[PDB]
Every structure is written in structure tokens, then in C-alpha cells.
Amino acid sequence: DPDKICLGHHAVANGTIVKTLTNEQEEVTNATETVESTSLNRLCMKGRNHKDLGNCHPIGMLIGTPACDLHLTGTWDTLIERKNAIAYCYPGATVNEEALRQKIMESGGISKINTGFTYGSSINSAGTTKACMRNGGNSFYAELKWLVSKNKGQNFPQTTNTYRNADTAEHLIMWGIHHPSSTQEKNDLYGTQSLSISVGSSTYKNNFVPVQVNGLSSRIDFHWTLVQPGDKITFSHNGGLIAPSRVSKLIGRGLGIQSEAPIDNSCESKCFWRGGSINTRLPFQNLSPRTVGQCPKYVNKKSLMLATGMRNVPE
Amino acid sequence: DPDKICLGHHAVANGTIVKTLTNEQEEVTNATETVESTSLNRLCMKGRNHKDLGNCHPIGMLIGTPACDLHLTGTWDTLIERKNAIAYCYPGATVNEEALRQKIMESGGISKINTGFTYGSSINSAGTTKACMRNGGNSFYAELKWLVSKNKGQNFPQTTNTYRNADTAEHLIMWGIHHPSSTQEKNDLYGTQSLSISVGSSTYKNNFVPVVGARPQVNGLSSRIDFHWTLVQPGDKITFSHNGGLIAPSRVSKLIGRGLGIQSEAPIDNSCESKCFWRGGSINTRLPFQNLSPRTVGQCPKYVNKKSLMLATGMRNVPELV
Amino acid sequence: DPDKICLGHHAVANGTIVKTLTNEQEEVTNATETVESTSLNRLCMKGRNHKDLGNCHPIGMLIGTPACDLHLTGTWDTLIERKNAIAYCYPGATVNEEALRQKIMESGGISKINTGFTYGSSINSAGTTKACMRNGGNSFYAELKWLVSKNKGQNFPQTTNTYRNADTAEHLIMWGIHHPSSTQEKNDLYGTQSLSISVGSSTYKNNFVPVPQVNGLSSRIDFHWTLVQPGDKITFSHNGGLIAPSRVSKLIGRGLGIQSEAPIDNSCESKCFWRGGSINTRLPFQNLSPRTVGQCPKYVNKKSLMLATGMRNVPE
Amino acid sequence: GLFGAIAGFIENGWEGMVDGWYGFRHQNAQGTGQAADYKSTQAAIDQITGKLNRIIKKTNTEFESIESEFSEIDHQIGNVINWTKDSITDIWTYQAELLVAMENQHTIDMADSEMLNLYERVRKQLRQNAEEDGKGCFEIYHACDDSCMESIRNNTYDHSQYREEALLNRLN
Amino acid sequence: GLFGAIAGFIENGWEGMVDGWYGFRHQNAQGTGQAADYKSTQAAIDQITGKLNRIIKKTNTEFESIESEFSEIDHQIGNVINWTKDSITDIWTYQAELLVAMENQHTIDMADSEMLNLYERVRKQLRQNAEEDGKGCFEIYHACDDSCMESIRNNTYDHSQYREEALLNRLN
Amino acid sequence: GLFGAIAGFIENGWEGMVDGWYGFRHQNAQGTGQAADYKSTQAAIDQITGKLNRIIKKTNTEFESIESEFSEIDHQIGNVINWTKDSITDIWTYQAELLVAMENQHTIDMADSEMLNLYERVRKQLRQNAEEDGKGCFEIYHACDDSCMESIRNNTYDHSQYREEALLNRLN
Ligand SMILES: *[C@@H]1O[C@H](CO)[C@@H](O[C@@H]2O[C@H](CO)[C@@H](O)[C@H](O)[C@H]2NC(C)=O)[C@H](O)[C@H]1NC(C)=O
Ligand SMILES: *[C@@H]1O[C@H](CO)[C@@H](O[C@@H]2O[C@H](CO)[C@@H](O)[C@H](O)[C@H]2NC(C)=O)[C@H](O)[C@H]1NC(C)=O
Ligand SMILES: *[C@@H]1O[C@H](CO)[C@@H](O)[C@H](O)[C@H]1NC(C)=O
Ligand SMILES: *[C@@H]1O[C@H](CO)[C@@H](O)[C@H](O)[C@H]1NC(C)=O
Ligand SMILES: *[C@@H]1O[C@H](CO)[C@@H](O)[C@H](O)[C@H]1NC(C)=O
Ligand SMILES: [Ca+2]
């Protein structure tokens, strides 16, 4: 009999379930995801001055292993280390290895500076090995010199070499200490004498005494220190020292990515992990708790759906 | 024609913008700030028994560098370290350096206790240097003795000194190990013999060998004195076996109570009060957040990456349109 | 004149006070607690394969102090260390002591493996002491051998022993180095000669040199340890003064390490523990201790926080 | 309150009502009666249950020790742990205080809403046959027997049936 | 719901309405008609947009590695990192679960509020010329042509014009 | 907003009203008058005070240094601290942004609620003797002198006294 006007709201056939403070199964017209589950299998290096090290291990850059020849110097904002990267062409390790790697991967480039170190004619500087191949012929670490007596068996002359840091910023000096297995090898190369190697600056001081991998029990182990601006560092040795021909300077800061995934200069990103890039605009992710850069926060959630619409009541 | 009563709410000409869950630009009658941006450039030490160390580095208090002569002892609830403070008059470092500094800066004072250590007449106790000046004449760390042979060149007598902690609370014993530059210097002072220094208690044990090597010169001296430390428990003893090269404790240190450790270049003010401090001074704000520095000490507002966060203290402002 | 129907809501005589965004003293019909204040003074080890060490210090398991005899071997998912537990029957310490303890307390068991070490007839293997008592008679660390010359005074023969790791997982080898105080004592067991002890594998290598009275003894036995990789060997060169491994240790899987003075109870279950015992509360917070282990309510600086489970209470 | 029902125009609650949270008291010729509304009571209780299911829980995360109860650890790493742990405890204390406070505010206002929602259902049902006294009662301007009351409560009251009688009584 | 409009006195929504969130259905002499209310639809959508702009973002903070993917790190510092990282993940998981849950509750109730707010605008506009059926409809007690309907929706309906006709029809 | 009083059916606020937050403007024979409602104003202010008491404070927790201002610290422990501290700052920045945003939303809606709650108190008081104009005013259908107005504001207005006069004026 009477005219009538009704107020109402829309609905949809297919609604989505979300969670509220009171209801675990609340159907609404529209929701959206807040946790990212998908990852790009590539490293998005667009608009980044990057350096993919490939088979070069960051420490190899400072001592100059063959593999790292293309990476002895440069400038970057991003540094990408790879799996099973090579630091040591001749068997050995660096003391405080991990601390050094982390320091290089925070760097935004590397300058090299000549020590200027010269040696008496009774010394052989360019001592090489079949382990470190370069131009398909026996070679050695580019930034170090293998110091051995020129006459096989002759006792090694007492030498003193000293680097001073002329620069206004700290310099990273590395050096090696050869320890052969057999007394026949040591006498042949350095002489019968007791060997002692003393290194000293204002900051640092240390003494070293030379004591089967690739068929060799003989090692070259590496040590490192920072040498302050204006300060000097002196090396006293009677043989067995692998001497720095160059010191390293780490410049500015850079993002260090450890990833097996391939480069792509077409795509951009500020967040990376082992398995690649994360360009999601979402505020959370559940891919990995180990990420680097500006990133969504890791959460222990497959999905968290955010209602973008009213309750859905069909019929 | 008809009588009428209207309900309404106040408004203001100048409203403030705040942020809600839905609106980034919401005008309300009144808001207030929640993040503190203002800082006092002074250290507010009212109602605090404080000790400004000045040129003295906290470690220097325990070994007794000249600079720290006024600060070998005392009681406090607040300890203020300064920039370029001096710990080492004679070149060297302390092993576990930072760990010790932090321990001293948590302390609420320092007692000193005599080791009572005595040495054979073939030993020289009062060995001094031009590096550590006191009364404008060659001296040494007040709390340690430089042990050297009395006859230049003579081998250093095997000695054994032992401190026992008679006290009811733990004691902090420090000692040094001299490493000279040249072998001419070591033989001259300790003798040709191989040197070995063993220190041992119930808790702790360690062996030390003076290292001889060419190194550069600090205050015209290439030789170093490096320091080591440990806690000696109540009732326990610690023994030093040495054939020369040990810098021996004449006194042990005892850290008393707890205290707030401030690292700040900023000056004191005993007129003003505060429970929160940072490099750049004090923070007295009653607000729950601040954006001055993430490095603060005491009871503090939480650091946030926000210039301002305005909290509505009034209703939506809808003004009379014109 | 007219009939009436009234709408209303329940109330109660005794309401609870809770806190809201606006009101610190809001009375409601019913609330519930969110912070747990009560703690069980026992360790609830039901449905867990546990090992209470008692007087045994975890390191003592690897060298085999008398006290640890019942715990030289086994499998577990939970390991309970106690206060003032004994590691060293003979005076000494282990270098990197705490690092080793933490490693053992993460473990889910210990296998023992024989080194197979053999010695010349000029050597005495079964050297014992009054400090380490076992079966009411002088004894020694079960997993090590005290190597001394058989003829009193005689200089100790240069010996070389080598362990190889036949297993597919890393093995934990420890050994000791005897330092006597007085040269008169050392002469009886080892000779006048300079003593030097070198141990070496692929992974690392080192040599150490023998140098106040504890349990009536001034002589010390200090211990060292390292991991020996699968397939690799470790060789021990000594001219006397080495305490030699008769067995190497192998850590199995992972396990929860509890440090607690509180007693066991196999009747009750829990996933959260602290010094003072177990925490089985279903609540999301607790204020008992910030040092807890397992799956736990989060520590909060709050005695109580009451969650309203009912409307405002407005009484008659 | 946000909705002005509970601790509002309704002067107080009923200790007498022990079969529900929200309900009715009527007054007719026959005498007086009281009854609970189930649907509105269950609505409130279900929402509070929901909160309890979400709030009364801990994480599945297994945490190991990083502090030895029975031995000293390096002083520097110890201070880092102390700082981190205290920083976390500050967060969780805050997150807890906020959660409970915010939920409490909502629990209250939610219950207020459910009362007002019942009143408004009744108001609309009675249409032009009753008037609000402003204390949460409807003065019904006709003979409403106990069957008529049960009809209001069970949402079966047809206003049209009593409309004529009611409009006369009202205009007088 | 807090406001009892959506999933309340309004029995269900309209799958048929695809030009807006809130709107009208009328029935007069001329026939039936449906139309969306723009202002009320936009109000709800703008508020939800607002939430999305705030919630869909990450921080500016650049985080470096403290865990090597390809090499072992000291066991003790590693356990500290593991503990810290797990503790942070617990917080962010909680903070995320709470945020979304709390926003969801609000988004819903906000939309409810916007429906009720439209109904109340219409109710007050029609004044004494219509009555609530309690299903979200107004029974209009006069001839309301399509121009009269468009006048209700466009907030131009002058109650005074139909008042006398309506009050007679109502009292009968 | 949620309650549609403020920035809703009430077109704007009154810069003129400086003795309260909520109040009345009347128009009768005698002339015009304005007055604040104390109880409703104090209700809103007390709730905002409450928020300020809870929000404006720091923790009791004493934090020590773990970063030396005047000396370099080990590179590895330093990176851990940097990561942890940045992670904490991200949390507290988020917790702060959410707190203030959520409180702001509530503060606003709370004040809206308190306006609507006063209107509804008056509406129910005037009963059948006035009608809503939809702008937050009641057209009173009888002679309401300044004593009659003061009676509306002071919640002492007896509808029955003017009912007869009012119902006649309304039906005409
Ligand atoms: C880390 O914090 C804890 C608890 O606040 C400290 O534990 C205290 O340690 C001292 C020993 O010097 C005792 O006197 C107290 O009784 C201890 N309290 C508890 C509850 O154990 C701990 O020392 C702090 N660590 C550092 C490095 O400062
Ligand atoms: C920190 O946690 C990581 C990940 O939970 C640990 O690495 C895992 O260790 C398990 C159990 O022993 C291995 O089976 C997995 O293969 C490892 N997973 C990954 C992804 O690395 C790591 O052991 C912990 N760090 C320390 C120092 O214990
Ligand atoms: C929900 O919103 C998103 C984002 O605007 C849109 O892509 C999607 O089509 C919407 N879904 C529905 C069913 O309207
Ligand atoms: C940690 O951050 C501070 C502040 O930017 C910086 O100065 C310092 O070098 C950082 N430490 C390390 C080890 O990167
Ligand atoms: C309330 O206001 C009216 C205004 O006329 C006044 O007459 C009455 O006495 C007041 N009541 C009280 C208790 O103040
Ligand atoms: Ca501390």
C-alpha cells in the first residue's frame, strides 16, 4: 500500500576470510596480502655500481691471487661474493680471516699503494710456484714477494723493510709467513740459521717462527693490521717472510651480498638474500631471516590478509 | 516560528594537523609532541656524587698514570670519561682493554690494597722513565714497579711473589709485561737467558714471553709495556713466577658498588638534574621518545627515526566557513 | 497508565579493576591475568629423555673424572648441569673452558671411541694419584693415561702416537700437559732434558712446554681440546709430560641445556625452564626471570596485567 | 561509554540477572517478569572468547642459553647481551601494557554496542506503539499481556495489530 | 557489529549493486529502482586507502650482513646473533598479527558506521513523513514519484511539502 | 566520523564557545543564549588526560654503554651491535607511529561519541514535544522560556508538563 525506500550495501559471490581481534574466520568483500612469499631468483643491480667477484674471494683482492687479477683495484657501492671463491693459490689461511672478509665487504672500493720495499742482491724477490698460474706460467700473489736466498743453501741476509703511511686515512697492510714441512726445504731456501720475523708499528707488534693439501704439507699463512695515518710499520726478518709489495686502502662504504644467484642489470632492488632480490612493496616477508639492505621484516607467517572492504553477507 | 535548542561543539581558528590510521592530514583543536628534539649541551649532575676524570682514562686509575694521580681512589655514583684521556704514559695497550674500561665505568668507586711484594737485592724495584713525569722528574705507574737487574747485563734472579685476597669481596689485580725493541736492551736489563712469566690462581692461569723486535717510536721509545688483568676471589691467592720482564703490582684495585658511566665532551652543571645522558649532554624531557642519538645511557626515552609525532589532545576542528 | 518493557545488562557485587587507554581504575564484571607470577620449584621432565649430571661438570664427561663415571656416554634431548659440579679431580683448568661447556650442553648425547694408543715397555701407562679416587683406591681420568718412565729417574723416550677419524662426523679429542712445581719431582718421572709436546692434524697444530698447593698438590694437569675432521689424522710427538687420550669424544645431535639447582619430577611436563625450575603457564607473559630456555612466555617488568573478559560493572 | 547504553542512559546493571548479560524486565496488568536475551549475550561472549584464543598463547620458538648461570662470561659480550635482553624486555612490557589496555577499551565499548544494538532492535519493532523514557525502557501505549511481551523478546511482535489502540492512547 | 547496520538490522548486502558500496532501493507507483550513494562509498574507500598507504611500506634502514652464508663464524657470537634475531622475529610476527587483526576489526566497524550514518541522514530528512520497518527501509506515507525518490538520495527532500498528506495517512 | 555528530550532521563547531567543548544554543521569545555542558566536556577531557598519563613516560630500565664514544671497538661485535640497535630503533619507530595514529583515531571518535551521547540524552528528554531538524537542533513545539531552556540543559525538563500544548502544535 505505502511507497518505501530501502538502504543497503554491496556484497560479492566469492569473499575472502581475514582475522580480527574477535573472529578467526571473518568473510569480507576484499582483502590484500601483507607477507611476501615470492622471491626473484636474480640480483637486481640496475642503478648500482656493482662488482661481481665470481671465483675471486674478497681477501684474494688484497694479496692478489691469480683469480682476483681483474679485482685488485676499483670503486663500487655493492660487492657480490660467490660460493667456493678462491683466496689462496698456495695452501694456507689468514688469521682473523672472517673479520677481514667482513671489512672488505663493507668497503666501497680499494686503492693500492706501493711499499717501495727493496732487497740486497743476495735475495731473490720474484720467487714463483706452479700452484699460482698466471699467463699459463709459474707466478705468485701480485701484492706480495716470495723472499728466498739467491744461492740454494746460503743463509738468508738479515733485512729490515719499513712502510710509512703518507696518506690522511688508515691503510691495510697484509704479509705472509712460509712454513715448510721438511728441514731439507727450509735450509735449501733460507739456510740452517734459526728463523725469526718481527713486525711492529705504534698500534701493532708480533713475532713469527716458521714451523698434505695439493700434495704439499708446506703452507703460506697470512696476517694483517691497519697502519694509522703518519705512522710506520717495520719488518725485521732473516728469511721466511712473504713481503708486501703493495698495501691496500678500503674507500667509503658498500653493500656486501653473499648470493649464488645470477646478475641482472635490467631490474632494481634495495633488499637481497642468498636466493636473490626482494622488490615487494609489502611490509613483511617469510623467505629468509638473513637479508641485507632496506627490507620487509621477516615474520613466521605464511599469510596475513588485511581487509580492504566491509563484511560480506551474501543472499 | 517555533522555539528551538541546538547542540554543538567548540572549534578554533588555528588547528593542528595530526596523523590517524586513515588520514595523514587530520585537523584537531589541540595536539602535543611525543618525540623530544631539544637537548641540553651540559651534563646535569645535581644530587649526584660525580667524578669528572678530565685527562685521566679510567684504566689509568688502576695502574696509576701520572695524569690519574688525583683519581687513584674514591667513591661515586657517576663517572665521566673525556676524549683523548691518558691511560699509558709508557707506550703499550691492555689485553681485553674495552672490557676493563666498561667494568670501571660500572663501578661506584675504587679501594687500593698493598700486594706487600718484596724482591732480592739483585733486583731494582724503582726503575723509572722520562715518558712518565711526576714532580717534573722521571717516574712510573704508581701502582706497579719496573723490575730490572741491579747490575747491567746480569741475568735476572728467578723470583716468586704471591698476593692473597684477605678481603670478603673480589679484588682486581693488573700487571705489565715489558717487550723491548733491541736484543741489546733485553740483555742489558734482564740478561741473555730465555725469559718466561707465569701467573696463576684458582680461577686464572697464563704464560707470557717478552717479544724483542724492531718497531717504530712513541714518545721517542720503541719498547712497549702491555698490561693484563684478572679478578682474584676472596680467600684465594695469585702467584707470579718470573725470571725478568714482569712489571709487578705494588697495589691491587677493589671496585665498590655500582655507578653510571658517561662518555661526553660536554661540561658539568651541578644546578640541573637528569637520569639520561649522551655524547652531546643531558636529556630531561618527560616525553616517551627522542631523535637526538641512539647512543644514550641511564633511564631514557626510546630513540625513534621521527622528527615529530603529534598526539591529538582534542576533537576534530571544523571551523566556521567564510 | 501505560505498560512498559525495560532493557538492561547484568552486574556483580565484586568487580575487578583493569586498565584501558583512558582509565587506570575501570571496574568490569570479569577479568583474567596475562602475566604468570607462580613458578614450579621442580624440573618437569615428563616425555623428555633427560640426563641429570648432579656433581658431574659437563667437561668432566669428556676426560672422565671419577664424579662423571655414570655420564661418560649416553643419548638425551635435555642435559641438566648443577652448581659447584666437579670437572677436575687433579688440580688444573681447560683452555677455552666455557666454549667447550656450551658445546656439550647443546649436544644430544656423547659417543666414546678408542684412540688405540700403544706405548714402549720403557713407559708406564697406568700412572695414578690419591686426588682422583675410584673403587676406594688411587686412580685417574678414565679417558686419559698418565705417561711416566717405568725406571725412576730415566729420561722419557721420544714417542709418536696418531689417531685417525674413521667416522663420517667430526670427533672431539682432548689431552692434558702435566707441569710439576719442583725440579726434584720432575726428575723422578721425566729426565733433565728439555720437554716439548707437539700435536698436529690438517686443521691446526701447536707445541707446549711444561713449567701454590690445591688438594695438597702444587703440580697441575692443564687440558687442551680440538675437533678432528672425518678421514683426517692427528699425531702426538712427546719426550714426556703428556697426559694422552685413551678415548676421543663424539657429540650426537642437539639437546636443551638447563642450568638449575631445582630437583627432577618425571610426573609433570614443560617446554620452558629457568634457574628456579619449570614454567607450564598457558599465559603469554611471565615476571619470574629474564633468563629462560625453551618455548617460553616473554619476560615483562609487570607484577600483573588484567585483561577484561566482561562489560563495565555498574552495581545497584 | 562510546555507545552511551552501559554506564550511560541505563542507570545501572542487574545483579538479579544470572542467566545472561543482556535482557528485559517488563511490567503489565498480570504483574512483572525478567528474561535474558541469548543472541546478544552470546555475541559479546563469542567476541571475548576470540580475544582469549588470540592473546593467551606463547611462540613455538625454542630459545637456547647465552648466559651461564654458574660461570662468568667475557665482560664486553656480557654487557651486549644485558643491553639487548633489557631492550627486548622493555618492548614486550610495552607491547603487553598497550595490548591489554587497547583490548580492555574495545571489550567494554563492544559490550556497550551490543546493549544499544538490542534497544534499537526493540525500538524499531515497537514502531509507533511505544515511547522511550530515556532510562532504557519503552512505555507501551496498549495492553501488552505476557504473550505480547514474549513476542517483543522473540522478535515476533507485529506493531500493526496494536497500532490503532496505541495511537489513540498516545494522542489522548 | 558495533553499529548494527551491516550484518545487523540490514539482513544482507546486494550482489546486484556494482556501482558503489552503499546505496538505495525504492518501490513507488512508477515501479522499482536501484542507485549507489557516492559520498558514503568514497568516505569508506578513502579511509581504507589511508590504511594501505601507511601499512604497505618497509623502513629506510640499511642492514648489513652479520652471518656469513659461505663460512663458519665464532660459535659464541653466533648463538648471541641467533638469540637476538629469533627474539626480533618473534616481536615482528606479533606486531604484524596485532596490526592486521586490529585494523581488520576497525575497517569492518568503520564501514558499518558509514552505512548507519547514511540511514540516520535519510531518517532525519524524512522527519514525520515516514516510519522505520526495522530492515533498513523507510515506509513513506505519501505519493513519492521518481523525482521525490531522487530528492531523498540527493539530500534535497523538503519534508514540509508532504507533511500534511503524510501525517493524515499515518494517523488514519 | 564513526558517530556522525562532529564533522557530520553538525555542519561545524563554534569558535564563540570558549567555556567548554560541547554545549547549547537556543532561540525563544526572550531572544538567543549560549551555554557549555560541563559533564560532557569533562568526560572527553578526562579520557584525553588518561591517555597522556599512560603515553607521556619512559621506562625505569637503566641502560649502560656498549659503544665507546672515544675509542674503536672490535669490528665483529660492533657490526652485531649496529644491527641489533638499528633493529630496535625500527621497532620503537613503528610502535610510536602506530600508538599515536591509533590513539589519534580513537581520541577523535571518542569526542564524536560524547557529542552524539549529549544529543541523544536531550532527544529522549524532549520526547514527543520536539522534532530533529537534522543539523543537531530540536524544533520545540511549545513556548520554552529561559527557565524552560535551563531545564533542558540541567536535565530537569518534564516532557509531560508541555505534552498537550506540543502535540496540538505538531499535528495542527
Ligand atoms: C648483567 O646483568 C645481571 C643482572 O642484572 C648481572 O648479574 C649480577 O652480577 C653481580 C656480580 O658482579 C651480582 O652481585 C648480582 O647479584 C648479579 N645479579 C643477578 C640477578 O645475577 C650481571 O653481572 C651483568 N653483567 C655484566 C657484564 O655487567
Ligand atoms: C644459528 O641457527 C642456524 C639456523 O637455525 C644454524 O644453522 C643450522 O643448524 C642446523 C642444526 O645443527 C643444521 O642442520 C642446518 O643445516 C643449519 N641451517 C642453516 C640454514 O644454516 C646455526 O647452527 C646456528 N648458529 C650456531 C652458531 O649454532
Ligand atoms: C580488491 O582490491 C584490489 C586492489 O585495488 C583489486 O586489484 C581487486 O580487483 C579487488 N577485488 C575485488 C573483488 O574487487
Ligand atoms: C656502526 O655505526 C656507526 C654510526 O654510523 C659507525 O660510525 C660505525 O663505524 C659502525 N661500526 C661498524 C663496525 O661498522
Ligand atoms: C537545574 O536547573 C534548573 C534551571 O531552572 C534549576 O531550577 C534547578 O534547581 C537545577 N537543579 C539543581 C539541583 O541545581
Ligand atoms: Ca653491566
From TrEMBL, chain A:
**Which cysteines are cross-linked by disulfides?**
C44-C267, C56-C68, C89-C132, C271-C295
Q: Which residues are glycosylated?
A: N30
Assigned GO CC terms: host cell plasma membrane; viral envelope
Quote the subcellular location field of this record: Host apical cell membrane
> Where does this protein hold Ca(2+)?
E106
Q: Name one GO molecular function term.
A: host cell surface receptor binding
Q: Which UniProt keywords apply?
A: Calcium, Clathrin- and caveolin-independent endocytosis of virus by host, Clathrin-mediated endocytosis of virus by host, Disulfide bond, Fusion of virus membrane with host endosomal membrane, Fusion of virus membrane with host membrane, Glycoprotein, Hemagglutinin, Host cell membrane, Host membrane, Host-virus interaction, Lipoprotein, Membrane, Metal-binding, Palmitate, Transmembrane, Transmembrane helix, Viral attachment to host cell, Viral envelope protein, Viral penetration into host cytoplasm, Virion, Virus endocytosis by host, Virus entry into host cell
Q: How does it sit in the membrane?
A: Single-pass type I membrane protein
Give the chief site where it resides: host cell
GO BP, sorted A to Z: clathrin-dependent endocytosis of virus by host cell; fusion of virus membrane with host endosome membrane; fusion of virus membrane with host plasma membrane; virion attachment to host cell
Which family is this sequence assigned to? Belongs to the influenza viruses hemagglutinin family.
* Task of the protein: Binds to sialic acid-containing receptors on the cell surface, bringing about the attachment of the virus particle to the cell. This attachment induces virion internalization of about two third of the virus particles through clathrin-dependent endocytosis and about one third through a clathrin- and caveolin-independent pathway. Plays a major role in the determination of host range restriction and virulence. Class I viral fusion protein.
How it assembles, according to the record, is: Homotrimer of disulfide-linked HA1-HA2.
| Protein name, entry field | Hemagglutinin
Species of the source: Influenza A virus
Gene name as annotated? HA
